[PDB]
Amino acid sequence: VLLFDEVEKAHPDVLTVMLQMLDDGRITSGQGKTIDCSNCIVIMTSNLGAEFINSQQGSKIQESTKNLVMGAVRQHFRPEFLNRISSIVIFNKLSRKAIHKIVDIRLKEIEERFEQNDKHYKLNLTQEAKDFLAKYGYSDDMGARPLNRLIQNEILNKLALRILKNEIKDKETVNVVLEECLEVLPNHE
Amino acid sequence: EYLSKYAIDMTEQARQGKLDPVIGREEEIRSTIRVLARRIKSNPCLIGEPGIGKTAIIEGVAQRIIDDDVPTILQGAKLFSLDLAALTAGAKYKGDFEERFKGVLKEIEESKTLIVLFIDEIHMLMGNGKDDAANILKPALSRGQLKVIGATTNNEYRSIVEKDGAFERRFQKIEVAEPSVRQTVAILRGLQPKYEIHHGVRILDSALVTAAQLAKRYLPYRRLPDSALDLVDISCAGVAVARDSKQNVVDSDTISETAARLTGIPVKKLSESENEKLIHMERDLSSEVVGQMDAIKAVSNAVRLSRSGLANPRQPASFLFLGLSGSGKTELAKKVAGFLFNDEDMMIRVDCSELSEKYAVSKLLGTTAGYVGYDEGGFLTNQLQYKPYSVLLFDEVEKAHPDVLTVMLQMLDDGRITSGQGKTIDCSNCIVIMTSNLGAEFINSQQGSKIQESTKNLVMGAVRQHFRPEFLNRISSIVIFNKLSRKAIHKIVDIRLKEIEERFEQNDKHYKLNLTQEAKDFLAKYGYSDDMGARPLNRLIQNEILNKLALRILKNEIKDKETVNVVLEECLEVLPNHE
Amino acid sequence: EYLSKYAIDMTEQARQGKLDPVIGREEEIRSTIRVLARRIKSNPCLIGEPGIGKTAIIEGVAQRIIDDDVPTILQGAKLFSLDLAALTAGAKYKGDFEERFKGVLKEIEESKTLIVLFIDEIHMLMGNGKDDAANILKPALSRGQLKVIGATTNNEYRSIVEKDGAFERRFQKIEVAEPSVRQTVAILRGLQPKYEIHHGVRILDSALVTAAQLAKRYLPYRRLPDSALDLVDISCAGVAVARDSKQNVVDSDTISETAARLTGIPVKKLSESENEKLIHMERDLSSEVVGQMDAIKAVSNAVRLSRSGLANPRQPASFLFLGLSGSGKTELAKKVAGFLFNDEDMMIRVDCSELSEKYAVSKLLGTTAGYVGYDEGGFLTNQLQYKPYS
Ligand SMILES: Nc1ncnc2c1ncn2[C@@H]1O[C@H](COP(=O)(O)OP(=O)(O)OP(O)(O)=S)[C@@H](O)[C@H]1O
Ligand SMILES: Nc1ncnc2c1ncn2[C@@H]1O[C@H](COP(=O)(O)OP(=O)(O)OP(O)(O)=S)[C@@H](O)[C@H]1O
Ligand SMILES: Nc1ncnc2c1ncn2[C@@H]1O[C@H](COP(=O)(O)OP(=O)(O)OP(O)(O)=S)[C@@H](O)[C@H]1O
Ligand SMILES: Nc1ncnc2c1ncn2[C@@H]1O[C@H](COP(=O)(O)OP(=O)(O)OP(O)(O)=S)[C@@H](O)[C@H]1O
């Protein structure tokens, strides 16, 4: 899989090369060899449509709203490029409904990525922690990014300190007031 | 026999138990077996990055042959490696090595059961215009004779086959995978007794795991089969050294410390008795800079997260510091570098004012192959490959032209910052601080020394109206500095005077001040700028106090312990050649 | 014994002494040893910038080896400095140097205790298109004992491994770096008797300190061991001349005059004539600057701060001269240079009406990588490299 991060920023000369790679596949090397990329999947990304998606006109992007986005992609990129893409997909807004599910996923991935995959959460407050994060992390026009940051800001930062103080082994738990915070394990570890 | 002179009987080394075992790699071994079992052109070649076990795999099949876990074609086999000596022994007497090589190949084909030749570093035979290659193996391999096993690096291969053609025809490349972390541990475990025996140490399973985990995360320039072993082997050596330098059980901490010594990642020192500093780094930073506690706390958490290992393995800490000039934005970054490595010059500074979107991206990451110049990326590439745990500072990012701000996106996300020569940095161990004065517009609304809502949001307004959201969304925390309060100024003056006094290399050059509050209040009254912050305190001191000192030194009116007095216009007293 | 025709037996020299003491490098040495003590990849490298003790480390470990202050594995090991003719003796006939390299490794590999090579300049082997081009002759056997300690700067290192790809998977980089200023002094101190003996002069302990501090605050292009040692050696040579003329390295005067000679920077010379220096300048300037004493004093104040060290080492003094057109402020800047250097034309200047967003930064500091024109430093650093204090 090839990934091109923010193709809208690439100078057009680049895109010009990619035109062959994306269609026909005979990208060649600087030394004169033919590579042939046709067995790859290519994903290119850009944010031009953000300017219209932020209008909140649908979670799933609505007709017209999508055309505003297509307007921008056509204004920015040569059609020679756009025509060669198998498909242009306009992402949906991550609605509050979505954030509820996303919170779950992120909490799980946070545990999964630990090196010390011992220090898991219990969380408690399934509905309250989920809701706290779902509400406070819902900066819709920033997608799910704020959520990740919220969890970091409210849970992990505190956790790290509690760890330095040996206040936690595992099964970490969350309380809420009113402001989401962490508890301690009386048994230092 | 020439094989006894220009080759190594790998089968015999395996027979004698002198080779390390191959752990798994069944798909690769099977692939080489199938190729060796071919009717024609039975010449597999292992292609992959260096350090992934290619040679080991071939030694692996030698072991399968030793124990008859191979096809009958291979059961009768003897495997020899080819020494470079076939050629490197010299070509005086033109054609001498050509004959030596022709000779050994003759002996290999000639009757004596199945002989398999392993040629390590197969690109060795590219040949200067071929000729030295002498294509001696070429027609031989084309007849299905001399089964040859090759092995080389992805790009070495490229330089062979794309400069030859025949190589691609003569060999069947087999990609060798880099093992997963889980597999890596299994490999280490399999090799563990070899190390335990060699070093005279015990290795615990958590050690094996630790090496594989740390290696993937902290040794990005070396593939797991080696990186994990390097951590184990070196840690074990550390035990051996320790014993002889004046118990022998290698564990996770043993390795973590070792890794820190090799990678520079301070997290892995695991010096928990130093948690006092990490826990209280907020007070420590507050002893150098005054107030601005939100910035201190924001940073402190970056550090604590990294120390705890909780920090996202791919997301360098990132900050955007907003506020008045003289607010302490840069000063804090210096003190962070100070705290983390006991060195304010540890910092890698990039001055964004020198940027130009038409040129300057290359100042950080360099240019690509072809364009004039190389030693690329003086600011980032050539620093980050040496000090992954350093603090980067990007001064005045709001002045950066957009293409540079675009570069920052890699840095602030994943850390996989690419380099002009097609290489990657992977700066996930980094802490990155950026500064900006966009907020000057609203922070100088003076709506509380501690900036309040609305005003703060207007600061974010300026940020949002300047930087693309794509950038802002990658900042761990955007921090708006507070305007210094008069009280802060007082404290700053005290600390700043302390720094100045401490700075002297000659212990005559100091003050007692007198006017223990009054001198400081003068400095505040005459240096408390709502739009220059503390910076004028530095200048005020230099002009009204240190120049008077310079005059006093010059005229020998001051010896030491100088004191301050005030006109109406702060001035200094005289402590002449009496002392 | 091919090795004996090409390499220097560092162990034998250490056995006979004839080596400098090694100061503060114990940990680089411990790391070197630890890697050498490894089961397989026992190939450490001393890496940094020139003049940072990379070969000092080797003399150091050679001495630790002589005294059995090394692990079992190294207890009886020997070490040889090779490179050199190993790659050039074979000036004719294909495969000749290649044979030597191989013969040397053979000599090392077989029986004769543990022999460790020291490669002073691994980049010289490089692997010039691989295909038997020297460095490439090694890798086959990098596992087979043949332990070797390498050495290279970071630029050289990066060039090698980027072009090669295998060495960075075979060798263990050890960071070697310049010492702190105090550590530098300890080094200078350690070599102090060497210089004192060869020049027949004494070095004041305070001269060692001055050289260390000075180098840190004087020569940004030279790493502290060499930089401070050169300040010491250069000074010692000057003292030796005084000794011969009819002594010691004077912390204040030998080093300051040496430094003043080598670079300049009025601050590093600091004249003793305090009754007039930094006083008379206001009168001299007053004659040039009639009435506007305010500017003179502003400048004089900064000048006075730089002298005797009140000025902050990282804050070049600087002024903005605002005022009535035709005030004479440009000449003032020159007249100040007059006093500062006894040279009104010492300065570097830029016509700012020539500056534009399209090019100005590069006109001032030079273009960057890949762009036309390598007049590095443009209008400014192009000149600062010659006169840092102008
Ligand atoms: N079972 C195994 N799987 C993978 N690697 C192993 C295994 N056993 C040992 N190793 C070590 O893995 C390292 C990889 O190096 P080698 O395979 O010898 O060299 P390489 O991987 O072929 O890369 P080059 O081309 O020799 S730099 C070796 O140092 C082996 O000691
Ligand atoms: N809160 C503070 N505590 C102590 N010293 C401070 C503080 N704020 C500013 N200073 C002084 O201000 C000087 C550097 O201040 P900064 O505000 O970081 O400079 P700066 O304005 O960041 O420069 P920039 O970032 O390019 S505008 C130092 O010499 C500090 O002594
Ligand atoms: N402890 C020491 N022992 C020997 N030499 C020292 C020592 N400390 C500093 N030096 C100086 O450093 C020189 C050799 O040390 P290095 O700093 O490695 O020089 P170098 O850069 O290794 O030499 P090359 O060949 O250019 S790498 C000596 O000639 C001394 O002048
Ligand atoms: N206050 C002063 N400071 C310095 N020089 C002065 C002053 N008053 C008169 N002069 C004389 O005026 C002449 C110097 O003039 P210039 O410095 O060329 O003019 P200028 O005002 O610097 O032009 P600028 O700076 O580009 S507006 C010399 O001959 C000085 O002696």
CSV table of N, CA and C in Angstrom, one decimal, chain A residues 6 8-9 31 33 47 50-51 106 113-117 119 141-143 145 148-149 152-153 156-161 163-166, chain B residues 158 162-163 213-214 217 268 272 275 278-279 301 304-305 307-313 406 409 413 468 470 472-478:
chain,number,residue,atom,x,y,z
A,6,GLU,N,-1.2,14.3,2.4
A,6,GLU,CA,-1.5,15.6,1.9
A,6,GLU,C,-1.0,15.9,0.5
A,8,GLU,N,-2.3,17.5,-1.8
A,8,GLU,CA,-2.6,18.9,-2.1
A,8,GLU,C,-1.4,19.8,-1.9
A,9,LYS,N,-0.5,19.4,-1.1
A,9,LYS,CA,0.7,20.2,-0.8
A,9,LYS,C,1.8,19.9,-1.7
A,31,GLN,N,17.2,5.9,-13.1
A,31,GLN,CA,18.3,5.3,-13.9
A,31,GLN,C,17.8,4.7,-15.2
A,33,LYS,N,14.9,2.4,-15.3
A,33,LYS,CA,14.2,1.1,-15.2
A,33,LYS,C,12.7,1.3,-15.0
A,47,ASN,N,-6.9,17.7,2.6
A,47,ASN,CA,-7.9,18.4,3.4
A,47,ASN,C,-8.7,19.5,2.8
A,50,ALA,N,-12.3,20.2,3.9
A,50,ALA,CA,-12.5,20.6,5.2
A,50,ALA,C,-13.3,21.9,5.3
A,51,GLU,N,-13.0,22.7,4.3
A,51,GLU,CA,-13.6,24.1,4.3
A,51,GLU,C,-15.1,24.0,4.1
A,106,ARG,N,-10.5,3.9,21.4
A,106,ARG,CA,-9.3,4.5,21.9
A,106,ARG,C,-8.9,3.9,23.3
A,113,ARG,N,-1.5,-0.9,23.5
A,113,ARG,CA,-0.2,-0.4,23.1
A,113,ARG,C,0.8,-0.3,24.2
A,114,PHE,N,0.4,-0.6,25.5
A,114,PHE,CA,1.3,-0.4,26.5
A,114,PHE,C,2.5,-1.4,26.4
A,115,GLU,N,3.7,-1.0,26.7
A,115,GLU,CA,4.8,-1.9,26.7
A,115,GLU,C,4.5,-2.8,27.9
A,116,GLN,N,4.3,-2.1,29.0
A,116,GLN,CA,4.0,-2.8,30.3
A,116,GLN,C,2.5,-3.2,30.3
A,117,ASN,N,2.2,-4.1,29.5
A,117,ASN,CA,0.8,-4.5,29.3
A,117,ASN,C,0.4,-5.4,30.5
A,119,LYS,N,-0.6,-2.8,33.2
A,119,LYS,CA,-1.2,-1.7,33.8
A,119,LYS,C,-2.5,-1.3,33.1
A,141,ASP,N,-15.1,19.7,14.5
A,141,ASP,CA,-14.3,20.2,13.4
A,141,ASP,C,-12.8,19.9,13.5
A,142,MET,N,-12.4,19.1,14.5
A,142,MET,CA,-11.1,18.6,14.7
A,142,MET,C,-11.1,17.1,14.6
A,143,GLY,N,-12.3,16.6,14.2
A,143,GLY,CA,-12.4,15.1,14.1
A,143,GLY,C,-12.2,14.4,15.4
A,145,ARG,N,-9.3,13.8,16.7
A,145,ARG,CA,-8.0,14.2,17.3
A,145,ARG,C,-8.1,14.7,18.8
A,148,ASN,N,-8.4,12.0,21.5
A,148,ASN,CA,-7.2,11.3,21.9
A,148,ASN,C,-6.5,12.2,22.8
A,149,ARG,N,-6.4,13.5,22.5
A,149,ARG,CA,-5.8,14.4,23.4
A,149,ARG,C,-6.5,14.6,24.7
A,152,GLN,N,-5.5,11.7,26.9
A,152,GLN,CA,-4.2,12.0,27.4
A,152,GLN,C,-4.2,13.0,28.5
A,153,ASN,N,-4.9,14.1,28.3
A,153,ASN,CA,-5.0,15.2,29.3
A,153,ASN,C,-5.6,14.9,30.6
A,156,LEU,N,-4.1,9.8,31.2
A,156,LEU,CA,-2.8,9.4,31.2
A,156,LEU,C,-1.8,10.3,31.9
A,157,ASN,N,-2.0,11.6,31.8
A,157,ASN,CA,-1.1,12.5,32.5
A,157,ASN,C,-1.1,12.2,34.0
A,158,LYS,N,-2.3,12.0,34.5
A,158,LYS,CA,-2.4,11.8,35.9
A,158,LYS,C,-1.8,10.4,36.2
A,159,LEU,N,-2.1,9.5,35.4
A,159,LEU,CA,-1.6,8.1,35.6
A,159,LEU,C,-0.2,8.1,35.7
A,160,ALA,N,0.5,8.8,34.8
A,160,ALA,CA,2.0,8.8,34.8
A,160,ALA,C,2.5,9.3,36.1
A,161,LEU,N,1.8,10.3,36.7
A,161,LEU,CA,2.3,10.8,37.9
A,161,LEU,C,2.1,9.8,39.0
A,163,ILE,N,2.0,6.7,38.7
A,163,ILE,CA,3.0,5.7,38.6
A,163,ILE,C,4.3,6.1,39.2
A,164,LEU,N,4.7,7.3,39.0
A,164,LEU,CA,6.0,7.7,39.5
A,164,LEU,C,6.0,7.6,41.1
A,165,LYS,N,4.8,7.9,41.6
A,165,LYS,CA,4.6,7.8,43.1
A,165,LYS,C,4.2,6.4,43.5
A,166,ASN,N,4.2,5.4,42.6
A,166,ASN,CA,3.9,4.0,42.8
A,166,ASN,C,2.5,3.9,43.3
B,158,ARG,N,19.8,-4.5,-6.2
B,158,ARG,CA,19.5,-3.5,-7.2
B,158,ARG,C,20.7,-3.2,-8.1
B,162,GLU,N,20.4,-4.7,-11.9
B,162,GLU,CA,20.0,-3.7,-12.9
B,162,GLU,C,21.2,-3.2,-13.7
B,163,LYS,N,22.4,-3.9,-13.4
B,163,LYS,CA,23.6,-3.6,-14.0
B,163,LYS,C,24.1,-4.9,-14.7
B,213,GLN,N,11.2,-5.7,22.6
B,213,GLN,CA,10.3,-4.5,22.6
B,213,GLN,C,11.1,-3.2,22.5
B,214,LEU,N,12.2,-3.1,23.2
B,214,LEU,CA,13.0,-1.9,23.1
B,214,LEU,C,13.6,-1.8,21.8
B,217,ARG,N,11.2,-0.3,19.2
B,217,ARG,CA,10.9,1.1,19.5
B,217,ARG,C,12.1,2.1,19.5
B,268,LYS,N,14.7,4.8,29.8
B,268,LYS,CA,15.1,3.4,30.1
B,268,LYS,C,16.1,3.3,31.2
B,272,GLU,N,14.4,5.1,39.4
B,272,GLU,CA,13.2,5.5,40.2
B,272,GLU,C,13.5,6.3,41.4
B,275,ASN,N,12.8,9.8,40.9
B,275,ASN,CA,11.5,10.2,40.7
B,275,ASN,C,11.2,11.5,41.4
B,278,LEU,N,11.4,14.1,38.8
B,278,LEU,CA,10.4,14.0,37.8
B,278,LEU,C,9.0,14.4,38.4
B,279,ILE,N,8.8,14.0,39.6
B,279,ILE,CA,7.6,14.4,40.3
B,279,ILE,C,7.6,15.8,40.6
B,301,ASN,N,4.2,17.2,32.2
B,301,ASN,CA,3.5,16.0,31.8
B,301,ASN,C,4.1,15.4,30.6
B,304,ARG,N,6.9,13.4,32.2
B,304,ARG,CA,6.4,12.3,33.0
B,304,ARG,C,5.8,11.2,32.2
B,305,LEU,N,5.1,11.5,31.1
B,305,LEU,CA,4.5,10.5,30.3
B,305,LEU,C,5.6,9.7,29.6
B,307,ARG,N,8.6,9.2,30.8
B,307,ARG,CA,9.3,8.4,31.8
B,307,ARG,C,8.5,7.2,32.2
B,308,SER,N,7.2,7.4,32.2
B,308,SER,CA,6.3,6.3,32.6
B,308,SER,C,6.1,5.3,31.5
B,309,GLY,N,6.6,5.6,30.3
B,309,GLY,CA,6.4,4.7,29.1
B,309,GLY,C,5.0,4.8,28.5
B,310,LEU,N,4.1,5.7,29.2
B,310,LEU,CA,2.8,5.8,28.7
B,310,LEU,C,2.7,6.7,27.4
B,311,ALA,N,3.6,7.5,27.3
B,311,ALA,CA,3.6,8.4,26.1
B,311,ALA,C,3.4,7.6,24.9
B,312,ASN,N,2.6,8.1,23.9
B,312,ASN,CA,2.4,7.4,22.7
B,312,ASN,C,3.7,7.2,22.0
B,313,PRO,N,4.1,6.0,21.7
B,313,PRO,CA,5.3,5.6,21.1
B,313,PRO,C,5.6,6.3,19.7
B,406,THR,N,4.3,23.0,6.9
B,406,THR,CA,3.9,21.7,6.4
B,406,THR,C,4.9,20.6,6.9
B,409,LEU,N,4.5,19.0,10.2
B,409,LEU,CA,3.4,18.0,10.4
B,409,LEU,C,4.0,16.6,10.5
B,413,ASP,N,3.7,14.4,14.1
B,413,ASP,CA,2.8,13.3,13.9
B,413,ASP,C,3.5,12.1,13.4
B,468,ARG,N,-2.7,26.5,9.6
B,468,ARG,CA,-3.8,25.7,9.2
B,468,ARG,C,-4.2,24.7,10.4
B,470,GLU,N,-4.6,21.7,10.3
B,470,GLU,CA,-3.8,20.5,10.2
B,470,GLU,C,-2.5,20.6,11.1
B,472,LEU,N,-2.4,22.7,13.9
B,472,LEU,CA,-2.8,22.9,15.2
B,472,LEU,C,-3.3,21.6,15.9
B,473,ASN,N,-3.9,20.8,15.1
B,473,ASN,CA,-4.4,19.5,15.6
B,473,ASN,C,-3.3,18.5,16.0
B,474,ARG,N,-2.0,18.9,15.7
B,474,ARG,CA,-0.9,18.1,16.0
B,474,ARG,C,-0.2,18.6,17.2
B,475,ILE,N,-0.7,19.6,17.8
B,475,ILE,CA,0.0,20.2,19.0
B,475,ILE,C,-0.6,19.5,20.2
B,476,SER,N,0.2,18.9,21.1
B,476,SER,CA,-0.3,18.2,22.3
B,476,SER,C,-1.1,19.1,23.1
B,477,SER,N,-0.5,20.3,23.3
B,477,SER,CA,-1.1,21.4,24.1
B,477,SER,C,-0.6,22.7,23.5
B,478,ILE,N,-1.6,23.5,23.3
B,478,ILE,CA,-1.3,24.9,22.9
B,478,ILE,C,-1.4,25.7,24.2
